[PDB]
Curated annotation (Swiss-Prot), chains A, B:
Residues 20-89 form the Peptidase A2 domain. Homodimer, whose active site consists of two apposed aspartic acid residues. The chain holds residues 501 to 599 of 1447 of the full protein. Residues 1-5, 49-55, 88-99 are annotated as: Dimerization of protease. This is Protease.
Length: 99, 99
């Protein structure tokens, strides 16, 4: 698809058989999801946004479908205003910025 | 321009006669720049992101050049860790996400 930016670029994702809404965010290095359970072990990560740093749980090799497109990679879980799909997964589904 | 997302989508902008580097961010509602002076009236605003909220100064009807493309709109100025071009100006240069 081609997504214009007049509205927030919110898509449906699927993770652990659950549908969720997520923001496609080209300013994010990483993908950050609201509190949920994921399989396997996690490792600690600190990430920075406009309001400062947050502590998140890093889960590697997580299956996630984004607007119909399969991706498998790192997902961080922590206090975030919205589920964010960052460049690590935007690259996997073939996403570019065009103007 | 077609921009891949392997790396941070950083572009050159021109604002108030100054050349600056800025992040194209499809997740930001608003454009927010690190501290600088801008002409005209401003009002205080609070904006949220990862890490919580920051206080910014809001300047309307500001002209910016983004990779050669002229855009006018609201520019916020405050303690952001990076210059961010958000959707309010990305729409004006006809920027889309494609996959
Ligand atoms: C996962 C980190 C995300 C990011 C990284 C910025 C960065 C880059 C390189 C180095 C250091 C830091 C990019 C980003 O889009 C935001 C948020 C949206 C998630 C953001 C950016 C710009 C402005 C706002 N505030 S706002 O009022 O314009 C706004 C508020 C809420 C939302 C919502 F959709 F997320 F809800 C979007 N925009 C928020 C942020 O806070 O940091």
């Amino acid at each position: 698809p081609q997504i214009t930016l007049w509205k927030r670029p919110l898509v449906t994702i699927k993770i652990g058989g659950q549908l969720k809404e997520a923001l496609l965010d080209t300013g994010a290095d990483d993908t950050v999801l609201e509190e949920m359970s994921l399989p396997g072990r996690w490792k600690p990560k600190m990430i920075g946004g406009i309001g400062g740093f947050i502590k998140v749980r890093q889960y590697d090799q997580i299956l996630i479908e984004i607007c119909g497109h399969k991706a498998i990679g790192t997902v961080l879980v922590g206090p975030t205003p919205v589920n964010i799909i960052g460049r690590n997964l935007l690259t996997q589904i073939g996403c570019t910025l065009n103007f």
